[PDB]
Structure 1
Amino acid sequence: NGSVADMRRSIEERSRTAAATDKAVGLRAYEGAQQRLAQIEGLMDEISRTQDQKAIE
C-alpha cells in the first residue's frame, strides 16, 4: 500500500533485514550449540562417578 516509492523503501528494508536476521539467528544458535556440547561433556563426566544401578539407569 502507499506510493511506489514507499513500496521500494519497504522492499529494500525487508531484503536487508532478512539477510541480517538470517546471519544473527545462525550466530546465536551456534553459541547455543557450543554450550550444548559443554553440557553433554558434563553429563559424561557424571557417568564416571555412577555407583549403583539405579543411578546409571
Structure 2
Amino acid sequence: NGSVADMRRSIEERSRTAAATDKAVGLRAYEGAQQRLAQIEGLMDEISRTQDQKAIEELQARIAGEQAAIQNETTKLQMIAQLRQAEQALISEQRRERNMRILSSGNQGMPTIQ
C-alpha cells in the first residue's frame, strides 16, 4: 500500500523484472543443457571401451544415474514455468487491487473550492 504513484512504479518495475528474469533463466538453463549434452557424449565415448563385465555394469548404472539427473532437470523446468504463471497472476491481481482502490466507493474525500 501507500501512495498510488508508488503503486504504479512498483507494478511497472515488477512486470519488467518478471519478464527479464524469465528470459535470463531460460537462456542460462539452455547453456546448462548444452553442458549436459557434452557430458553425455563423453560418457558414451568412454563406455565404448570397457573391459570387464563389472566395469560395463557399473558405468551402465552411472548412465542411468545421469538419466535420473536429467529427469530431475525436467521437473525443475516445469516447476519454474508454474512459478512464472503464478507470479504473472499475482501481478495482475495487484493491478486489480490498485484499480479497485482508486475507484472504490469507500472513498469520501472531495476537492473543495477555496
TM-score category (smaller protein): over 0.9
Per-residue CA shift, 1:3-57, capped at 9, x if unaligned? 0000000000000000000000000000000000000000001111101000999
How many percent of aligned residue pairs carry the same amino acid? 96
TM-score scaled to structure 2, two decimals?
Answer: 0.47
TM-score scaled to structure 1, two decimals?
Answer: 0.92
Give runs of ≥4 in structure 1 deviating > 6 Å.
none
Structure 2 gaps of 5+ residues are 55-111
User: Greater RCO between the two (CA within 8 Å, min separation 6)?
Assistant: 2
2:10 aligns to what? 10
1:40 and 2:34 are equivalent in the alignment: no
Decide which structure has the larger Cα Rg and report it: 2
CA spacing shift, 1:30–1:51, aligned 2, 3 Å = same
Paired with 2:2 and 2:41, the residues of 1 have a C-alpha distance of: 55
Structure 1 gaps of 5+ residues are none
Q: Secondary structure at the match of 2:51?
A: coil
